[PDB]
Amino acid sequence: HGYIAKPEPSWKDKKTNDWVVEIEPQWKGGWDESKGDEGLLATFKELSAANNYKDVRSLMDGNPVYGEDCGFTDPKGKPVAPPTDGTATFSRGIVHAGPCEIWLDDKMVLQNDDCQSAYGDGTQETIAVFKPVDYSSCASGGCMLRFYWLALQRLDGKTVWQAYKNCIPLTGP
Amino acid sequence: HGYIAKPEPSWKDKKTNDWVVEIEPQWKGGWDESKGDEGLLATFKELSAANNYKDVRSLMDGNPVYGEDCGFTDPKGKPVAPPTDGTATFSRGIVHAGPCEIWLDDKMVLQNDDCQSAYGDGTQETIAVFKPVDYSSCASGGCMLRFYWLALQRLDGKTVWQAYKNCIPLTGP
Numbered sequence: 001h002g003y004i005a006k007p008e009p010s011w012k013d014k015k016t017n018d019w020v021v022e023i024e025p026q027w028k029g030g031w032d033e034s035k036g037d038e039g040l041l042a043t044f045k046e047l048s049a050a051n052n053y054k055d056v057r058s059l060m061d062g063n064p065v066y067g068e069d070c071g072f073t074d075p076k077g078k079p080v081a082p083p084t085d086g087t088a089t090f091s092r093g094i095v096h097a098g099p100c101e102i103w104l105d106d107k108m109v110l111q112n113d114d115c116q117s118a119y120g121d122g123t124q125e126t127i128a129v130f131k132p133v134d135y136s137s138c139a140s141g142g143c144m145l146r147f148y149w150l151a152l153q154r155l156d157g158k159t160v161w162q163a164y165k166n167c168i169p170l171t172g173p
Numbered sequence: 174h175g176y177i178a179k180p181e182p183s184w185k186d187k188k189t190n191d192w193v194v195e196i197e198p199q200w201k202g203g204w205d206e207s208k209g210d211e212g213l214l215a216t217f218k219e220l221s222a223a224n225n226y227k228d229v230r231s232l233m234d235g236n237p238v239y240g241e242d243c244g245f246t247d248p249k250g251k252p253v254a255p256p257t258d259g260t261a262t263f264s265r266g267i268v269h270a271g272p273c274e275i276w277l278d279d280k281m282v283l284q285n286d287d288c289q290s291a292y293g294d295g296t297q298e299t300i301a302v303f304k305p306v307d308y309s310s311c312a313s314g315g316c317m318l319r320f321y322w323l324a325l326q327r328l329d330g331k332t333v334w335q336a337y338k339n340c341i342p343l344t345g346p
């Protein structure tokens with residue numbers, strides 16, 4: 001659960017930290033065998049190479065199983081100035097395994113195969129900070145930050161994928 | 174397949190009738206279970222209201238799943254004078270169902286839910302003519318015409334959406 005809090009998104013309705021969708025793993029495999037995050041991430045790594053995976057954005061964009069574009073955030077909201085310290089900040093700590101990435105228009109500016117282990121300490125209470133994030137490519141006149149996170153979890157023995165997506169319009173830098 | 178031929182477009186590379194993207198339907202539905210172009214249009218109409226649809230431009234602009242702005246046409250191409258007869262002419266007949274629209278800068282000057290039935294006869298050989306089109310709003314010093322068409326078709330039983338986009342720079346009246 002969670003959303004990018006800085007820079008600050010607008011909301012189609014109200015603020016929520018919920019996932020866009022929660023679905024069965026879209027690639028057949030031994031997901032349910034894993035007792036913990038290490039196993040899930042290993043399965044993801046192998047099965048993604050079996051399924052022509054590139055990145056989370058290429059996986060989700062254009063496929064309605066992953067739910068609506070931009071999730072609960074509003075791409076048409078008033079654009080905000082990005083942070084000046086080369087970061088983005090999450091609304092909470094990252095407590096699920098799985099890959100995440102930040103895009104500024106068509107440029108991927110941050111990516112990790114396991115955002116949980118890279119940007120927080122795995123607890124909810126320590127706020128996750130994404131870094132480095134270079135906003136310098138943001139077109140004058142403005143650009144769209146997009147966050148994508150595919151959380152992998154085994155929920156009482158049954159593995160699910162959750163898709164988290166934010167769109168956050170920025171002013172040019 | 175096709176492009177607005179009058180007024181005359183310029184091309185990033187070479188003239189092409191092709192679609193910008195071909196994607197699965199972006200709204201989950203009974204596309205494949207319906208019959209004929211009429212079934213595609215009735216599904217589109219009903220799912221439109223489920224998915225907050227306004228118009229084709231609003232669907233496509235700012236969403237990379239619908240591919241690059243202006244498609245294969247060049248917005249930095251040669252400015253051309255608009256037709257004097259209150260029409261735009263396509264490069265061929267229109268042989269796929271679905272909505273299309275013409276814009277002059279931020280003004281929508283023509284929209285139809287099914288360009289196939291409104292502007293041609295369903296065959297490639299009867300040149301489609303869009304009408305009525307009023308070019309009188311074109312700023313002195315120029316405007317940009319934009320054409321948007323979301324084609325709906327079944328390809329060996331599997332429904333796809335295709336995006337066609339043109340931009341054509343016009344001289345001012």
Ligand SMILES: [Cu+2]
Pocket residue numbers: 001002096
């Ligand atoms: Cu969660």
Ligand SMILES: [Cu+2]
Pocket residue numbers: 174175269
């Ligand atoms: Cu075609």
